[PDB]
Design an enzyme around this catalytic site. Structure first.
Site, PDB file in Angstrom:
ATOM      1  N   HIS A  15     -37.868 -11.270 -36.486  1.00  0.00           N
ATOM      2  CA  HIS A  15     -37.214 -12.393 -35.763  1.00  0.00           C
ATOM      3  C   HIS A  15     -38.050 -12.848 -34.564  1.00  0.00           C
ATOM      4  O   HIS A  15     -38.038 -14.015 -34.253  1.00  0.00           O
ATOM      5  CB  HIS A  15     -35.808 -11.966 -35.300  1.00  0.00           C
ATOM      6  CG  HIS A  15     -34.978 -11.327 -36.363  1.00  0.00           C
ATOM      7  ND1 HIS A  15     -34.573 -12.021 -37.486  1.00  0.00           N
ATOM      8  CD2 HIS A  15     -34.460 -10.087 -36.465  1.00  0.00           C
ATOM      9  CE1 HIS A  15     -33.830 -11.240 -38.240  1.00  0.00           C
ATOM     10  NE2 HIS A  15     -33.741 -10.041 -37.636  1.00  0.00           N
TER      11      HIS A  15
ATOM     12  N   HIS B 101     -39.250 -10.147 -25.098  1.00  0.00           N
ATOM     13  CA  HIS B 101     -39.666 -10.918 -26.277  1.00  0.00           C
ATOM     14  C   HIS B 101     -39.654 -12.388 -25.905  1.00  0.00           C
ATOM     15  O   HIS B 101     -39.212 -12.757 -24.805  1.00  0.00           O
ATOM     16  CB  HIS B 101     -38.736 -10.639 -27.459  1.00  0.00           C
ATOM     17  CG  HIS B 101     -37.334 -11.041 -27.167  1.00  0.00           C
ATOM     18  ND1 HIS B 101     -36.414 -10.226 -26.534  1.00  0.00           N
ATOM     19  CD2 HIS B 101     -36.717 -12.228 -27.351  1.00  0.00           C
ATOM     20  CE1 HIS B 101     -35.287 -10.918 -26.353  1.00  0.00           C
ATOM     21  NE2 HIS B 101     -35.448 -12.148 -26.857  1.00  0.00           N
TER      22      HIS B 101
ATOM     23  N   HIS C 100     -39.133 -16.606 -27.610  1.00  0.00           N
ATOM     24  CA  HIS C 100     -38.708 -17.581 -28.634  1.00  0.00           C
ATOM     25  C   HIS C 100     -39.670 -18.758 -28.478  1.00  0.00           C
ATOM     26  O   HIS C 100     -40.001 -19.126 -27.326  1.00  0.00           O
ATOM     27  CB  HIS C 100     -37.267 -18.029 -28.464  1.00  0.00           C
ATOM     28  CG  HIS C 100     -36.295 -16.906 -28.409  1.00  0.00           C
ATOM     29  ND1 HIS C 100     -35.584 -16.489 -29.507  1.00  0.00           N
ATOM     30  CD2 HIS C 100     -35.990 -16.049 -27.412  1.00  0.00           C
ATOM     31  CE1 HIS C 100     -34.826 -15.450 -29.153  1.00  0.00           C
ATOM     32  NE2 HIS C 100     -35.078 -15.144 -27.878  1.00  0.00           N
TER      33      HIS C 100
ATOM     34  N   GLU D 114     -34.809 -21.798 -25.805  1.00  0.00           N
ATOM     35  CA  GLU D 114     -33.382 -21.669 -26.166  1.00  0.00           C
ATOM     36  C   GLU D 114     -32.553 -22.416 -25.130  1.00  0.00           C
ATOM     37  O   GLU D 114     -31.835 -23.378 -25.471  1.00  0.00           O
ATOM     38  CB  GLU D 114     -33.018 -20.188 -26.270  1.00  0.00           C
ATOM     39  CG  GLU D 114     -33.852 -19.497 -27.342  1.00  0.00           C
ATOM     40  CD  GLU D 114     -33.122 -18.343 -27.984  1.00  0.00           C
ATOM     41  OE1 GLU D 114     -32.806 -17.372 -27.255  1.00  0.00           O
ATOM     42  OE2 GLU D 114     -32.858 -18.419 -29.211  1.00  0.00           O
TER      43      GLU D 114
ATOM     44  N   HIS E 207     -37.720 -13.674 -22.591  1.00  0.00           N
ATOM     45  CA  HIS E 207     -36.494 -12.917 -22.275  1.00  0.00           C
ATOM     46  C   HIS E 207     -36.856 -11.485 -21.898  1.00  0.00           C
ATOM     47  O   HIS E 207     -37.314 -10.735 -22.777  1.00  0.00           O
ATOM     48  CB  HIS E 207     -35.539 -12.917 -23.464  1.00  0.00           C
ATOM     49  CG  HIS E 207     -34.948 -14.267 -23.698  1.00  0.00           C
ATOM     50  ND1 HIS E 207     -34.360 -14.660 -24.902  1.00  0.00           N
ATOM     51  CD2 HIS E 207     -34.898 -15.343 -22.879  1.00  0.00           C
ATOM     52  CE1 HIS E 207     -33.950 -15.908 -24.781  1.00  0.00           C
ATOM     53  NE2 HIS E 207     -34.238 -16.343 -23.537  1.00  0.00           N
TER      54      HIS E 207
ATOM     55  N   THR F 188     -28.498 -14.262 -27.903  1.00  0.00           N
ATOM     56  CA  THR F 188     -28.754 -15.534 -28.627  1.00  0.00           C
ATOM     57  C   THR F 188     -29.094 -15.297 -30.097  1.00  0.00           C
ATOM     58  O   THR F 188     -29.364 -16.293 -30.797  1.00  0.00           O
ATOM     59  CB  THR F 188     -29.875 -16.341 -27.969  1.00  0.00           C
ATOM     60  OG1 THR F 188     -31.099 -15.612 -28.173  1.00  0.00           O
ATOM     61  CG2 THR F 188     -29.616 -16.647 -26.512  1.00  0.00           C
ATOM     62  N   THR F 189     -29.078 -14.048 -30.559  1.00  0.00           N
ATOM     63  CA  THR F 189     -29.198 -13.731 -31.999  1.00  0.00           C
ATOM     64  C   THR F 189     -27.996 -12.903 -32.394  1.00  0.00           C
ATOM     65  O   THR F 189     -27.388 -12.241 -31.544  1.00  0.00           O
ATOM     66  CB  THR F 189     -30.464 -12.955 -32.342  1.00  0.00           C
ATOM     67  OG1 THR F 189     -30.374 -11.604 -31.882  1.00  0.00           O
ATOM     68  CG2 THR F 189     -31.703 -13.608 -31.781  1.00  0.00           C
TER      69      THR F 189
END
Ligand SMILES: NS(=O)(=O)c1ccc(OC[C@@H](O)C[Te]C[C@@H](O)COc2ccc(S(N)(=O)=O)cc2)cc1
Ligand SMILES: NS(=O)(=O)c1ccc(OC[C@@H](O)C[Te]C[C@@H](O)COc2ccc(S(N)(=O)=O)cc2)cc1
Ligand SMILES: NS(=O)(=O)c1ccc(OC[C@@H](O)C[Te]C[C@@H](O)COc2ccc(S(N)(=O)=O)cc2)cc1
Ligand SMILES: [Zn+2]
EC number: 4.2.1.1
Length: 259
Positions: free
Chosen positions: A63, A93, A95, A105, A118, A197-198
């Protein structure tokens, strides 16, 4: 088993069927309306204390990629701001997008950044991360926007290891990495109560989103986009557009640390 992702067939529009909290009252990310966010003079100063951080490993989880830390002691902690007590850094991590005009995000007045960092921390009053995600004040995630411009020197060690973790389930040693090199100059922030958010989308996060983006080079973010969502020996699917869009704010107030 988990089969959520970011495709047309398993992406954010599908998640609610296995994770009904996806339609909950405190979902993340959100759009930060800078004209509706209110300065809160009650916020205490933010304290990022990463001097003793001990990075361990970098993992492609299918992911994103996570840089994991030793969280067995108060080595790298976040305190202050909206937070009560001590939050330990467990991982960071990103995005990111397929192009520089998308990837973040959170949005700021509907602006999308190229990526978002994040830094994930858990409240030590709950003893471990798995207990913390079950609590409304269990996690604090420090979010940092990335724009494309000049290179970020403190990101290059991350960029240079990515070709060793191209596919899902690959990991590499990642010791002696200093996450202080990923911060902007200013700790001015917005804060609101939200979620992971996942999946599993748990409503356990105090979000702290820095106003000042960091600059990374086009070459740095291009290396993020060479990763794969798939495992070794499966059809190649580039790891791009691994972001959830903005969710309804509902009955929440975003507070600013700054005038
Ligand atoms: Te054919 C793609 C996929 O396998 C279809 O099955 C799914 C399984 C779970 C999810 S979800 N609700 O966890 O997003 C979405 C799709
Ligand atoms: Te106390 C835990 C120990 O020191 C580190 O454990 C971790 C366990 C999972 C993660 S991850 N892949 O979810 O980022 C990161 C660190
Ligand atoms: N029974 S229940 O309370 O409903 C319940 C349901 C599911 C549970 O699964 C717990 C496991 O920890 C899986 Te959560 C760790 C996973 O590593 C994801 O961590 C993330 C970290 C940061 C972000 S982000 N993008 O927001 O920063 C996103 C994901 C536990 C309890
Ligand atoms: Zn994240």
């Amino acid at each position: 088993s988990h089969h959520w992702g970011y495709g047309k067939h398993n992406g954010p529009e599908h998640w609610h069927k296995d994770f009904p909290i996806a339609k909950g009252e405190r979902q993340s990310p959100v759009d930060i309306d800078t004209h509706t966010a209110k300065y809160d003079p009650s916020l205490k100063p933010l304290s990022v204390s990463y001097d003793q951080a001990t990075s361990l490993r970098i993992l492609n989880n299918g992911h994103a990629f996570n840089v994991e830390f030793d969280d067995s002691q108060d080595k790298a902690v976040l305190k202050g701001g909206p937070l009560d007590g001590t939050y330990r850094l467990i991982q960071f991590h990103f995005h990111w997008g397929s192009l520089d005009g998308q990837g973040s995000e959170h949005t700021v007045d509907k602006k999308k950044y190229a990526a978002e960092l994040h830094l994930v921390h858990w409240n030590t009053k709950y003893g471990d991360f798995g207990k913390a995600v079950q609590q409304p004040d269990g996690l604090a995630v420090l979010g940092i926007f990335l724009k494309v411009g000049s290179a970020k020197p403190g990101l290059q060690k991350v960029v240079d290891v990515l070709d060793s973790i191209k596919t899902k389930g690959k990991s590499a040693d990642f010791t002696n990495f200093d996450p202080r090199g990923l911060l902007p100059e200013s700790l001015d922030y917005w804060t609101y109560p939200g979620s992971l958010t996942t999946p599993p989308l748990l409503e356990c996060v105090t979000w702290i989103v820095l106003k000042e983006p960091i600059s990374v080079s086009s070459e740095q973010v291009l290396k993020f986009r060479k990763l794969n969502f798939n495992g070794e020996g499966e059809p190649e699917e580039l790891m791009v557009d691994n972001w959830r869009p903005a969710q309804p704010l509902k009955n929440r107030q975003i507070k600013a640390s700054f005038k």
